[PDB]
C-alpha cells in the first residue's frame, strides 16, 4: 500500500536523524569507553551484574536495520549505556566517570533532537 511506503518513509528519515544522534553521542565518548560490548572472555562475571549489556556498535547494528521505531527507544539504549557503567564501575574509576560526562554533554544533544522528531514529525 501506498500508507505503508509513507510510514516506511518516516522510519527511513527518523533513522537519519537517529545515525546524526549517534555519531554526535559518540562524539562525547573520545576515550572509546563506549564503543564496544563490555569483552565477556575479559570480564567473565559481567552477566551476573549487568542484565541487559549495551553499547554503541550495538547500537548502530539495531539502527541500521531501522529498529529504532521512534526515539524513545533510542534513549533506552544510550540510557542503558550510560546506567550499566555507573551500576559496575566505582565513582572513583575513569570508567564512571567518562559515563557521567557522557550523559550530561548527551543531554545537549537529545534535548534538540526531541523537538526535531516532533517538530518534523
Given at each position: 500500500?501506498?500508507?505503508?511506503?509513507?510510514?516506511?518513509?518516516?522510519?527511513?528519515?527518523?533513522?537519519?536523524?537517529?545515525?546524526?544522534?549517534?555519531?554526535?553521542?559518540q562524539?562525547?565518548?573520545?576515550?572509546?569507553?563506549?564503543?564496544?560490548?563490555?569483552?565477556?572472555?575479559?570480564?567473565?562475571?559481567?552477566?551476573?551484574?549487568?542484565?541487559?549489556?549495551?553499547?554503541?556498535?550495538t547500537?548502530?547494528?539495531?539502527?541500521?536495520?531501522?529498529?529504532?521505531?521512534?526515539?524513545?527507544?533510542?534513549?533506552?539504549?544510550?540510557?542503558?549505556?550510560?546506567?550499566?557503567?555507573?551500576?559496575?564501575?566505582?565513582?572513583?574509576?575513569?570508567?564512571?566517570?567518562?559515563?557521567?560526562?557522557?550523559?550530561?554533554?548527551?543531554?545537549?544533544?537529545?534535548?534538540?533532537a526531541?523537538?526535531?522528531?516532533?517538530?518534523?514529525?
Amino acid at each position: 500500500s501506498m500508507e505503508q511506503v509513507a510510514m516506511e518513509l518516516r522510519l527511513t528519515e527518523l533513522t537519519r536523524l537517529l545515525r546524526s544522534v549517534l555519531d554526535q553521542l559518540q562524539d562525547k565518548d573520545p576515550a572509546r569507553i563506549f564503543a564496544q560490548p563490555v569483552s565477556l572472555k575479559e570480564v567473565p562475571d559481567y552477566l551476573d551484574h549487568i542484565k541487559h549489556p549495551m553499547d554503541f556498535a550495538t547500537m548502530r547494528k539495531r539502527l541500521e536495520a531501522q529498529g529504532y521505531k521512534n526515539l524513545h527507544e533510542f534513549e533506552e539504549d544510550f540510557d542503558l549505556i550510560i546506567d550499566n557503567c555507573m551500576k559496575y564501575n566505582a565513582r572513583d574509576t575513569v570508567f564512571y566517570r567518562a559515563a557521567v560526562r557522557l550523559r550530561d554533554q548527551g543531554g545537549v544533544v537529545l534535548r534538540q533532537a526531541r523537538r526535531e522528531v516532533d517538530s518534523i514529525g
